[PDB]
Paper text:
A subset of complexes additionally includes a single arrestin-like protein, arrestin domain protein (ARRD-6), bound to a CALM-1 subunit. A third class includes the auxiliary subunit ARRD-6 and was resolved at 3.5 Å resolution. Upon classification of the single-particle cryo-EM data, we observed a non-two-fold symmetric 3D class defined by an elongated density feature protruding from the CALM-1 auxiliary subunit and we hypothesized that it corresponded to ARRD-6. We fit the predicted structure of ARRD-6 into the corresponding density feature and although the local resolution of the ARRD-6 region is lower than that of central region of the complex, the fit yielded overall correlation coefficients of 0.69 (mask) and 0.65 (volume). Moreover, density features for the ARRD-6 β-sheets are clearly observed at the binding interface with CALM-1, as well as for the crossed elongated loops of the N and C domains at the central crest, further supporting the assignment of the density feature to ARRD-6. We observed a ‘C-edge loop’ structure, positioned at the distal edge of the β-strands in the C domain, a feature which functions as a membrane anchor and is necessary for activation of arrestin39. The C-edge loop of ARRD-6 includes W197 and multiple cysteine residues, the latter of which may be palmitoylated and thus poised for membrane anchoring. Additional contacts between CALM-1 and ARRD-6 involve a loop of CALM-1 (P51–K67) with the β-strands in the C domain of ARRD-6. Structural alignment shows that the TMC-1 conformation within the ARRD-6 complex is most similar to the E conformation. At this juncture, we do not know why we observed only a single ARRD-6 subunit bound to the complex, as there is sufficient space for two.
Here we report the single-particle cryo-electron microscopy structure of the native transmembrane channel-like protein 1 (TMC-1) mechanosensory transduction complex isolated from Caenorhabditis elegans. The two-fold symmetric complex is composed of two copies each of the pore-forming TMC-1 subunit, the calcium-binding protein CALM-1 and the transmembrane inner ear protein TMIE. CALM-1 makes extensive contacts with the cytoplasmic face of the TMC-1 subunits, whereas the single-pass TMIE subunits reside on the periphery of the complex, poised like the handles of an accordion. Single-particle reconstructions and molecular dynamics simulations show how the mechanosensory transduction complex deforms the membrane bilayer and suggest crucial roles for lipid–protein interactions in the mechanism by which mechanical force is transduced to ion channel gating.
Residue numbers in the entry:
A (entry chain D), G (entry chain F): 18 to 63
B (entry chain J): 27 to 368, 382 to 400
C (entry chain A), E (entry chain B): 75 to 459, 664 to 880
D (entry chain C), F (entry chain E): 18 to 201
The structure:
């Protein structure tokens, strides 16, 4: 509807469902961005 | 060299001893000519040897590990390796006897067993080191009775009671009920001893049920060599007993001491946490088997195999018979290839204790 | 005789109660319990009926306490999460999460107290309100039609204006009626005042109770300690909580380094060095820190001054001091740590310097914000002198500050930990230099700064819970989000510190900061209640010239005039200053007392 | 009903664990080895059901503990190499946070010795150094540390630390309760 | 070798300082001194000129300190008197005399402070007063010719009327002029206020310093003591200062009795007894003590109320409040001891109970007298309203109370000590019963009661030194007369006690009571300064609507109005009441904290 | 003055006295016996000026003290039965109220022994009790007092009290510095 | 002279002179009113 009264509502709803989806995925996974010190040492040595 | 040694023997006054006792023996060596010998030594070694076969990435890997539980040595004849004297003692031709005495430690020692994946052997190794020739070795095996299990322990004197009931329909309809109650006086038992059981059964089903009791020997072999390690899961039913069938919509009472003796088979003693390399425990499984083979209401008991019965003073004099092990239990079904020379005869085999059956006359 | 039996009973009770403190086996413990039970059964037929009544009452009380403990253990949340963070990262990081869980409990209790007695009665009365009550409360509970068209504009709802400005979230939503309704006789302004007082009283109660529990019953044996360096760094040098391979390896390396450095220092015992460059760097950094603090002061003052509009003329500038303050609170600490590179010394005193600078920054920002808000609001009142509502405006300011703080904290977590970690992982192989072994690193969980964040947020809540009854209720959700995001960030993007020290090595240090901030926050509410004049068109205190009147109007109606006049003379400054002097003197007496006892236990 | 009402009452009275904690510990005990522990353990079954120290060492709590074997031995029953459910309960209730400082000090002292003579000798402390550091220190450095420890923590000049001396010296450490703690 | 020189100089300084404190043989100390002086002479020519100048300054400062100590030792009076009283009666009786000598020093310092800055410049200005100043102050300095003829009437002078009312001694003699005279510009009212503040400041400083020197620097190791009964009753069981055969024999028998009773108590260890009669007697004694205290309150109130006349209508009844109150303070304590006969128990606790009851009586009499006096003056000022001078009248009441206290104390000493001792000596031969072996005896010195009398008199001095600047000048003479009379009486009429105890066995018990009384006396002077309004026809504060104004008008002349307005709001009740709550909370927390610390120590 | 500047400066350094106190002590010392003590006393004279113990015990300050002989013997020089001016001044300088608590404690411990082995044995304390009580207690009473003193004031179980134990025990007494004091 | 203006003054000077005389002589003397315990014991024995 209005670009200043309803576009923000749609953007917020899309952001909310995207945030819920992102939270859900993370909740069932155990991503570990840092690497173990052993492989870091082997990479640094080579 | 076989051409130089004429006779080699190891002799003991007794073949089985108890934990903590003093063991005595002798080595008899007979030679015909003078042989230069730096020395002859005797060692005591109790070794656990485990071999586990695994498959990784399509490649078969054999993991071999050893544990030395007993390590005692004593010089019998000659000079030590640190003796720099060149005067080597000479043993005169003929027969010579060297006696030796050792004391077993009071700590718990794992019992001997012979299996494909794990073998525990307590032995004496006599080495006659000889210059410019291969040193002969003589190995003699014996059986260590353990662990030290005493039936007066408070954990074993308490009675055990169990009960269960199952309804095949909606609780409202009491029809189809199956109820069992079992009481045992204790949990520790001696090989060859009768187990006292009492039980009440109520069966309201349309088909008869039989009480199946199975003794399951769980023998787990664990090796440590490896990033993750390899374990062996091994389970067998030692013996199975079936109770008389119970009529439909009826009740019955059962007692081993009154109906028939539930014969416990000659089995190795319970060995839990005495040796790190193998775990052995006994599970008594009780279930009800229908005419179609369906099992339900499984009850598991941990079984303890003791050696000393519950003894009050005015106890009978000790001697009870020694007999050969049964072939239907673990420890007798497999023999190492090094033990058979070629009616099969085995060089060494465990000997267990039993009381002779009721001789009427 | 009777004395012997009483002594035997006392000994048995002492053995039973102290049994949990004896290093005995389970079999021996069970045998002792059975023997005590048999002795109690034997002595049962030895006493009279009254003793049996006391015994059964004690047994029932113990059973009720045990049942309450069992039920309470069912309502304690976030146990597995705390256990996992502990066994992966240690027992110094997890203290933050335990403290946050206790803070959430305190905020839940505060919300319950502020909700059963203020918000719920008012909303219940509004639901069944008659025509007259609606006519009286329309000016405060209904948005005017002129501004209703602009109720949602991505700026009105973001500033808590419009639909939120007339919500139970603010103080002005409530009625002025002394009586909420007939046959019930609920005093609304009195309940409001008493709830505001009781919340502060309960905060003091909880903080002091936890302090006493951690001090007397937990660490009363730590007093009078000296030297014992190797005993402290070797006998209590292993963390039993660690259950990870890399964490254990880092701990082993840290303890080896600690022992080696301690022995190296104790061997040479020579510390002689004087570099003019080092002293110049130290003085330059200490000057620049004060310059940056003055810059923060000027920035917050400029932000509060530029928001000089009361009408809804523009909103892209009124939203500044929400965004300036928070930014500083989340950017200045990190730069502080960078200054620690110039000041190279012992990591323990480096952490002490960092904590001191951060605490000074937070206190200065808080005091300046309060002064600026009060000056601006008094200027607005003087200019306007229907009349504007000031409590609701202050509630708007505090809630906006809290919300922008939460948003900036989320942004900082997503940038410093998540995005930085992914960038390092996927871009350190081909970068210009060895940035994995350089300054950037991976990122370590700073316990001190985050606990200071929690304390500052709770201080803002305490300051602003009078003008907005439903601020603790929002703070519950804020703290839950904070705990979950902190747990995810620490488990997913952070590595254990190679060596970790503590600013105080004491349990009641952060609670000391919390109590100090509670007092610094109860000062302005006290001043506002005592001196400031309520608005005439909003809130339940619009019928009085002072906030406190609703209490004394109750006191003066039930107490005689002569006794009240005699009592009022206590408040003279010349009778009060001696009281303050006496309190300081007795505190000084106890401080010598404390000192003496400590010397004794040495 | 795995545990009776009176059994749970005695478990709560002896230890620092509520019914939920006891049930969780039973679940962990079962998950260690499902075959060896029966589903019903009512009675004296906890006293007779034991696991070897190697199996218990595999759990994540004690996996990286340098003194896992010492802890298992100290908290074990009269048997050697066996750890039972009751001893498991005692081990995790002594380590718990709600246990007072006295019990933690007593069991830490009883863990820290090896011979069992109620005294901390040079051999015991050297072995603790070599186990905790993982043989990463030189012998001279280890000896220097041991000498400092005995000279700065002994008042009778016996080169040994007793239980009372231990409780006097290490109870003033603020990190002991934080470190000597296991969550389970 | 700067480090070696510093170490050597430190060792030499320690050796020099610790020589007097080392338990060495005298020749060993001399040998150490020669070694130290030789090493110092050798080390002299090792350093530069600046170090030599610093050493010269240090040794010159030590020389000044030694010379000052020597000079101070020449101005310490009453040495042989205390020495002889000590050698005759012990080291517990002489504690009262040392305390009284310290009190005399404190009072002399107070008199000097109040005399250099107030009375002397005022009298100097009056001696050179001009015609205009004389005309202005005739109504307050020069006695009217109407009353000048009746200046002496055997009752006017005894009431401090007539020539005494118009002397500097009283408040109203000092002129209202802002400046005493030209070229000096001495602000008399400002000097008055500043001296009144400095008196209390110096009293607090002296009491705190003496307590610190007695506790911190003397018995710092006396804290945390337990058991050691027989060591303390055997190793410290002899008084070394006793030098009389009779006193030595008495203390020998006393220590024998202490050991025997201690052994008897520690052997039997059984305390079981319950008599209804003794309980009834104890409760009756406690009830009659309260009733007798209430009788004291009623008598004081009636005495102040009946003195409703201000003019010289009659003087045989106007002098009934100083006389009656005094006699209570001197007659009520003794009967207390008689009541202690009914409540028989351990002397220690009986003496502690007597001290508590006497302290309660003195405090209640002080409070009632001050309340009645202030109320009577307020009522009389309202009835009369040139205006009457209430401050001068209150000063007259305080001075008359002090003088009547001195007269009654002298009479009590002459009757209880002299007359009773003479009667026993000259009448025990043919008396009806052996009074010498009965309740009378000869008279034992009571240290606690007399120290309490000294403390109470000093309390009256503190309370009344604002309305009468030269009250300490009178109190110096009163204390000197009291000390001489007490010494003569203890030599000539008293006998050593068979067993004398201490209420607390601490050197800071009477000083603690003195500090509490100082606070109790700074309460009403502070209230008068803060609340009451000065008279317009007397004193140098007649030109202000309040007492403290003379300070504020001096602050406002040099301080801007904006900063003054900012600093005013801090004293708001809503900032002070939270401070009182904070101090109460920290007091309770430190009390519990102190408790925990003591538990740990034990 | 009668003393040289060096002499009185040294006396002020070692002792706790001012010029007036030293002059007064000189006057008292002369008053003990006018014949032997010279009026002029500059130089080495105080080191050689000695009098018998009986002359010192005649003054009223120590006339009634039961332990006068022990005090003079403890404060005396190597010579037996002779007390010098320096020893007299040290004796009345430690006893003064200005001397710190440590010095009084040390000299009291030195005085209270009899054999002189730096150890307070049973016989020493028994003799001290018999001197203080003036033989007004039974033998069993003395034995009980001795047993209580030994059992309550011993930490190493040596049946004796050393200087450290004495300081730890009687320095906490509030009546010590008040009693261990003689004004002069 | 005067009964209310001078008689009290004359009594005051007389009393002051008498008190000065009492203080003077007494201060020099060393009177000890109480009797020693030896005299008490001697009286009790007799
Ligand atoms: C300025 C001056 O001389 N003051 C005097 C005064 C005096 O008391 C008064 C009597 O009427 O007369 C005034 O003139
Ligand atoms: Ca982070
Ligand atoms: Ca935050
Ligand atoms: Ca040991
Ligand atoms: Ca008085
Ligand atoms: Ca007297
Ligand atoms: Ca001795
Ligand atoms: Ca000793």
């Amino acid at each position: 509807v209005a670009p200043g009264l309803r576009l923000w509502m749609l953007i917020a709803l899309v952001g909310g469902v995207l945030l819920i989806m992102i939270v859900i995925v993370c909740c069932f996974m155990r991503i570990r961005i840092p690497r173990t010190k052993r492989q870091i040492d082997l990479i640094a040595a080579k | 060299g076989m051409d130089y040694i004429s006779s080699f023997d190891i002799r003991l006054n007794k073949d089985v001893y108890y934990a903590g006792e003093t063991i005595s023996g002798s080595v008899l060596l007979e030679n015909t000519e003078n042989i230069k010998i730096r020395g002859i030594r005797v060692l005591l070694r109790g070794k656990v040897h485990a071999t586990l076969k695994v498959v990784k990435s399509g490649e078969r890997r054999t993991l071999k590990d050893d544990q030395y539980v007993l390590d005692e040595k004593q010089l019998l004849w000659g000079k030590d390796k640190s003796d720099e004297s060149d005067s080597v003692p000479i043993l005169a031709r003929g027969v010579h006897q060297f006696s030796f005495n050792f004391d077993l430690p009071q700590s718990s020692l794992p019992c001997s067993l012979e299996s494909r994946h794990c073998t525990i052997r307590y032995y004496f190794k006599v080495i006659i080191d000889i210059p410019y020739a291969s040193s002969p070795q003589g190995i003699k095996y014996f059986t260590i009775i353990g662990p030290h299990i005493d039936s007066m322990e408070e954990k074993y004197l308490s009675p055990l009671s169990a009960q269960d009931r199952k309804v095949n329909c909606c609780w409202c309809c009491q029809r189809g009920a199956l109820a069992l109650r079992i009481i045992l006086e204790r949990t520790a038992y001696v090989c060859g001893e009768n187990i006292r059981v009492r039980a009440q059964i109520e069966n309201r089903q349309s088909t008869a049920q039989s009480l199946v009791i199975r003794l399951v020997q769980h023998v787990e072999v664990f090796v440590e060599k490896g990033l993750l390690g390899e374990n062996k899961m091994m389970s067998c039913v030692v013996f199975e007993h079936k109770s008389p069938a119970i009529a439909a919509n009826s009740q019955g009472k059962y007692d081993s001491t009154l109906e028939q003796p539930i014969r416990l088979p000659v089995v190795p003693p319970t060995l839990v946490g005495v040796c790190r390399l193998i775990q052995i425990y006994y599970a008594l499984r009780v279930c009800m088997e229908d005419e179609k083979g369906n099992e339900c209401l499984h009850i598991d008991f941990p079984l303890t195999v003791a050696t000393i019965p519950y003894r009050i003073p005015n106890a009978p004099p000790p001697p009870v018979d020694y007999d050969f092990c049964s072939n239907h239990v673990e420890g007798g079904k497999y023999v190492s290839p090094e033990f058979r020379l070629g009616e099969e005869i085995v060089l060494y085999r465990p000997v267990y204790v039993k009381l002779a059956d009721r001789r009427i006359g | 005789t009777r004395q012997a039996l009483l002594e035997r009973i006392r000994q048995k009770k002492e053995v039973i109660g102290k049994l949990r403190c004896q290093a005995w086996s389970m079999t021996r413990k069970r045998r002792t319990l059975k023997l005590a039970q048999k002795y109690l059964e034997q002595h049962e037929s030895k006493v009279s009926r009254s003793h049996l009544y006391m015994e059964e009452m004690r047994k029932r009380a113990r059973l009720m306490k045990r049942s309450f403990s069992n039920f309470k253990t069912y309502l304690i949340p976030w146990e597995s999460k705390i256990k996992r963070i502990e066994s992966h990262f240690g027992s110094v990081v997890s203290s933050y999460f335990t403290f946050l869980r206790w803070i959430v409990f305190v905020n839940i209790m505060i919300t319950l107290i502020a909700l059963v007695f203020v918000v719920l009665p008012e909303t219940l009365a509004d639901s069944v309100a008659n025509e007259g009550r609606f006519n009286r409360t329309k000016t405060r509970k209904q948005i005017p039609a002129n501004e209703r068209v602009h109720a949602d504009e991505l700026a009105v709802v973001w500033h808590y204006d419009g639909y939120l400005r007339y919500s139970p979230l603010f103080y002005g939503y409530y009625s002025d009626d002394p009586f909420l309704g007939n046959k019930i006789k609920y005093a609304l302004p009195l309940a409001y005042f008493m709830v505001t007082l009781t919340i502060f009283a309960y905060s003091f109660f909880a903080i002091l109770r936890k302090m006493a529990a951690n001090a007397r019953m937990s660490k009363l044996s730590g007093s009078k300690a000296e030297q014992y360096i190797f005993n402290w760094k070797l006998f209590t040098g292993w963390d039993y909580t660690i259950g990870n391979s890399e964490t254990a390896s880092n701990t082993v390396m840290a303890v080896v380094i600690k022992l080696r450095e301690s022995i190296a220092d104790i061997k040479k015992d020579a510390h002689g060095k004087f570099r003019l460059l080092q002293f110049s760097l130290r003085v330059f950094a200490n000057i620049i820190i004060c310059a940056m603090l003055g810059f923060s002061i000027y920035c917050i003052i400029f932000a509060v001054q530029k928001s000089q509009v009361q009408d809804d003329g523009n909103l892209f500038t009124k939203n500044q001091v929400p965004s300036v303050v928070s930014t500083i609170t989340h950017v200045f600490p990190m730069i502080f740590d960078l200054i620690g590179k110039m000041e190279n010394y012992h990591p323990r005193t480096a952490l002490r310097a960092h904590l001191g600078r951060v605490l000074i920054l937070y206190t200065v920002n808080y005091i300046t914000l309060i002064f600026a808000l009060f000056e601006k609001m008094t200027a607005l009142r003087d200019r306007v002198n229907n009349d504007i509502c000031w409590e609701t405006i202050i509630g708007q300011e505090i809630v906006k500050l809290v919300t922008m703080d939460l948003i900036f904290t989320i942004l900082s977590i997503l940038v410093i930990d998540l995005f930085r970690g992914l960038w390092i992982k996927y871009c350190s192989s081909w970068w210009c230099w060895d940035i994995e072994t350089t300054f950037p690193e991976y990122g370590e969980f700073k316990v001190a700064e985050n606990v200071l964040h929690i304390i500052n947020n709770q201080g803002m809540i305490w300051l602003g819970l009078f003008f907005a009854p439903l601020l603790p209720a929002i703070n519950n959700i804020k703290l839950i989000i904070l705990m979950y995001i902190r747990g995810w960030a620490v488990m997913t993007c952070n590595v254990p510190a190679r060596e970790i020290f503590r600013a105080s090595r004491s349990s009641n240090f952060y609670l000391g900061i919390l109590l100090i901030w509670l007092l610094l926050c109860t000062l302005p509410v006290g001043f506002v209640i005592a001196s400031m004049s309520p608005s005439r068109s909003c809130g339940p205190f619009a019928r009085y010239q002072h906030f406190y009147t609703v209490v004394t109007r109750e006191i003066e109606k039930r107490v005689d005039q002569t006794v009240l006049s005699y009592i009022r003379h206590i408040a003279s400054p010349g009778v009060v200053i001696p009281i303050i002097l006496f309190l300081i003197l007795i505190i000084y007496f106890l401080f010598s007392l404390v000192r003496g006892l400590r010397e004794a236990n040495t | 009903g795995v545990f009776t009402r009176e059994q749970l009452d005695e478990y709560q009275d002896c230890t620092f664990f509520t019914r939920k904690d006891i049930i969780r510990l039973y679940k962990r005990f079962y998950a260690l080895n499902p075959h060896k522990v029966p589903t019903n353990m009512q009675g004296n079954r906890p006293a007779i059901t034991t696991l070897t120290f190697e199996e218990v060492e595999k759990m994540p709590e004690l996996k990286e503990n340098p003194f896992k074997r010492r802890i298992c031995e100290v908290f074990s029953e009269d048997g050697r190499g066996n750890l039972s459910f009751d001893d498991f309960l005692d081990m995790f209730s002594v380590f718990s946070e709600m246990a007072p400082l006295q019990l933690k000090l007593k069991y830490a002292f009883r863990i820290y010795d090896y011979d069992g003579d109620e005294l901390l000798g040079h051999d015991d402390l050297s072995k603790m150094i070599r186990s905790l550091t993982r043989d990463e220190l030189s012998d001279v450095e280890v000896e220097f540390i041991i000498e400092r420890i005995i000279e700065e923590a002994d008042l009778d000049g016996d080169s040994s630390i007793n239980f009372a001396e231990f409780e006097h010296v290490v109870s003033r450490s603020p990190d002991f309760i934080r470190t000597f703690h296991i969550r389970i």
